[PDB]
Design a protein around this ligand. Sequence first.
Ligand SMILES: CCCCCCCC/C=C/CCCCCCCC(=O)O
Ligand SMILES: CCCCCCCC/C=C/CCCCCCCC(=O)O
Ligand SMILES: [Cl-]
Ligand SMILES: [Mg+2]
Ligand SMILES: [Mg+2]
Lengths: 212, 210
Amino acid sequence: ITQSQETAILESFLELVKSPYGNFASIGKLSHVLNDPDTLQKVVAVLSLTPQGKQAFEDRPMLGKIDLEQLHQLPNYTLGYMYADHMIRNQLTPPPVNENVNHPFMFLAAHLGETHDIWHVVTGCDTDKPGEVKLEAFYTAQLIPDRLFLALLAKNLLKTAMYEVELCEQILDGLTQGWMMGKRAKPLFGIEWNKLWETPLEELQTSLNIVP
Amino acid sequence: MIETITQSQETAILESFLELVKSPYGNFASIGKLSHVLNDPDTLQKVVAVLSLTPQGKQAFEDRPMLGKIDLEQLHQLPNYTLGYMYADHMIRNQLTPVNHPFMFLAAHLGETHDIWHVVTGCDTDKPGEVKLEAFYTAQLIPDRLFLALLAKNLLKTAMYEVELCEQILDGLTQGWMMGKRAKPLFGIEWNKLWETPLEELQTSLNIVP
Ligand SMILES: CCCCCCCC/C=C/CCCCCCCC(=O)O
Ligand SMILES: CCCCCCCC/C=C/CCCCCCCC(=O)O
Ligand SMILES: [Cl-]
Ligand SMILES: [Mg+2]
Ligand SMILES: [Mg+2]
């Protein structure tokens, strides 16, 4: 990499070390500079080696508009109930329906962006700090050879060492668990979640080889 | 964290971390500079106190046991299965070469047994082996901050410069972390009187399962 690209990476990395979790603007900035088109094409090609991956780039399945209230009426063992409950408790607002996902790079980012909270629920990762690290290790296992989630792991390890080292064991226990769970699970990329709202979460996890 | 990391400490820690990111592995100078600003005396005091909770830890700060001079050639005359031979062999193959205050003993004991921890834990010398060993250290030296920050810098270096190692690097981290929590404390061991112990028996005694 050029010295210029390197300084933009390190500057974004420093902003993430110094700011709270969930700094999506700086994560996006780090992403732009860290995952270049060559990296993104290799991720697209790897994900495309499975039939579910290949089809998802062809069909570009999107979530669509989500009715949190209606999902919250489902039986409380379903994916739909659990997802809605996760959104209420964490004060999260569902993703805005997006339309420009033509290029594979744009579908990759839009699909992963809008299903982030669903992957939280399906992998069983809490939204506390060790749970975010756990989910990032899970992403790292599934999106090889991506660079972003590896760097997000690094940023959270440094943040732990500098500001809150009492969390060390819980943070590395989470990273360790999400890495192993990520290697063992089936690919989550490309799944059409809005057809699974009434599926019981535990059976969905079992069929995905997720053992929470 | 109840103690402060001041603005000034944060600035010095980040500058030291950036130099480690831009330098190759094995920069023991720059690692010492990160250590000095990151493991400040409050942290070193807690590490000493935590390590002194065991009898071997307490004794090690009293007696301050040091390796002393070591004759690699003589150690390399021992049976193949021994710690002494295995260590000497490790030094020869990689062409490596080998205090009254608690914080000074702490740093000098860990610095001089670093190669021995490599041998005893079974960590290779390549980059994934260093990360494995670093994870082993952060399991054993809670509430230290240096080794966690060293994991962070090697994950960032992998993301930026050598992403194809990602799998090996996180497999190494994961194995070292688990092995480190499961093993008995390695700190404070007088290795100079274990050279003739078969390495595999010493590992069993220490609950090290490679
Ligand atoms: C494989 C290439 C990936 C490029 C697209 C990445 C965009 C995916 C969007 C989901 C990112 C969610 C990560 C947010 C973590 C917040 C916790 C933290 O601050 O560490
Ligand atoms: C608990 C307080 C620790 C204070 C002692 C600090 C020094 C410890 C001994 C040095 C360990 C060397 C580990 C460095 C591995 C080199 C690979 C790399 O560059 O990442
Ligand atoms: Cl939650
Ligand atoms: Mg979420
Ligand atoms: Mg999250």
